[PDB]
Ligand binder design. Sequence first.
Ligand SMILES: C=CCCn1nc2c(C(F)(F)F)cccc2c1-c1ccc(O)cc1O
Ligand SMILES: C=CCCn1nc2c(C(F)(F)F)cccc2c1-c1ccc(O)cc1O
Lengths: 233, 235, 9, 10
Amino acid sequence: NSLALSLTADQMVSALLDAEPPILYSEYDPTRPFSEASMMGLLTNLADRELVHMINWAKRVPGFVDLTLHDQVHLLECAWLEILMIGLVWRSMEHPGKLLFAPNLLLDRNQGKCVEGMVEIFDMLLATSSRFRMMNLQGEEFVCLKSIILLNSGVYTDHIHRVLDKITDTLIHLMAKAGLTLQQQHQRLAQLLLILSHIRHMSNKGMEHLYSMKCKNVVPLSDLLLEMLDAHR
Amino acid sequence: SLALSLTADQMVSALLDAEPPILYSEYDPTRPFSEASMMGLLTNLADRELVHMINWAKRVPGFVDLTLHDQVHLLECAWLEILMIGLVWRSMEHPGKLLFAPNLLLDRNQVEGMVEIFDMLLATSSRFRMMNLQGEEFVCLKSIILLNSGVYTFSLEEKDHIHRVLDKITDTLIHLMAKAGLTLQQQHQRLAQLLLILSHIRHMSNKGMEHLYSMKCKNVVPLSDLLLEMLDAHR
Amino acid sequence: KILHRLLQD
Amino acid sequence: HKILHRLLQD
Ligand SMILES: C=CCCn1nc2c(C(F)(F)F)cccc2c1-c1ccc(O)cc1O
Ligand SMILES: C=CCCn1nc2c(C(F)(F)F)cccc2c1-c1ccc(O)cc1O
């Protein structure tokens, strides 16, 4: 029997809020990147550091700890980029037209376009950020979505499903607490969950781009990123 | 718009009536097939299915209110997701098998690559079965894919209209579940379960699109002009 | 574009 | 032999 299923909505929200990894910084060099080398150097370095916090965050998502190690590994292998991406989108909400990779690293689409294949992904991220903003997405809602991605993305490739239901219960509780009518609640739940389809899409396209970058073998990639990337091919 | 004025029951009727037919393949159990020929069956089939899909899309409430430019974009984005969900739906009652056509049922043991994708399609089919997915729910899910899959990669008033129709479809889904005797908690849970499956459908589409690109470049398995064009759109 | 053509009648 | 196997333990 998993402890996760015994938590109340409020306890689930607190658990997830408390598990949030911090927002990390990029290098303090004030040089705005405008080349594949510089930009991807910064992005992979950041991602590498964030991954370590993500791994420890995952362990704190109710129900994740009840999985075998092999299952935990699979979920993380499937979801890591989706999770990095939804974090980026969340951080960027308050900066229309900008992607806040870190507080000292805001990139725009004019920088994306100095790297073949990048602007299309940047533009998708920006649109997702805009969507979040116009939906007035809340932090409590964000942490639920992120947990859903972790548990759902690799789930095919009963426990997980029961935990996923609990997170749904928790999203509805949040919306009811915020005063939404019953119709507004199901409409909003659907809206949030459909965005996960787009997050998946961006991760998949990103993954393709990174595979290409890996082969070009110019951008330095950590062994951990290599393994995370390898899991997808 | 007329789409916005539909009752849930009217939305459902309209979608059911708009269902495309189930097509046959050219499979012949007496004929030898290669990986290439077996694939040609799937591509030949998909090509004929596309024509019906295009005509199906026009009967999805809201779709024809969009510019031709936007209709084109939505179909280019969603065509494989839509073929795939239909395949998984057709396959529900055939455990371990994918019913591409009434005369074409393939199991995992049937190609070079693709087995990974087959396996995912099988899992999704098993998933539908376990949930006892209803036809009324299926046609809602399929319309959602059409409208939603390309909505974030295009006046952006057009986008607002799409979001409104999408909300209507959520209303319709909830309506169906309520009418099925589900508690409110159960409705919300099932709604989420259904929508999360769309992420998996997106994944399978993305992975298939990549596999199809290799097949093209390999230039062995035949591909119709329309399929080449639909593929190019993702690249 | 074929798809464009098919979409308009 | 996967790094993730190690990290998930500690
Ligand atoms: C190998 C790790 C890099 C992760 N990554 N890749 C991104 C791409 C593309 F290269 F895949 F196209 C486009 C936009 C953002 C990308 C990220 C990324 C996302 C969030 C984050 O906090 C750090 C990142 O490097
Ligand atoms: C060029 C059109 C083929 C469409 N297609 N591709 C499939 C694949 C893979 F080759 F992309 F990996 C795996 C499984 C099914 C695939 C289909 C397909 C799906 C549904 C349908 O009704 C017809 C199809 O050819």
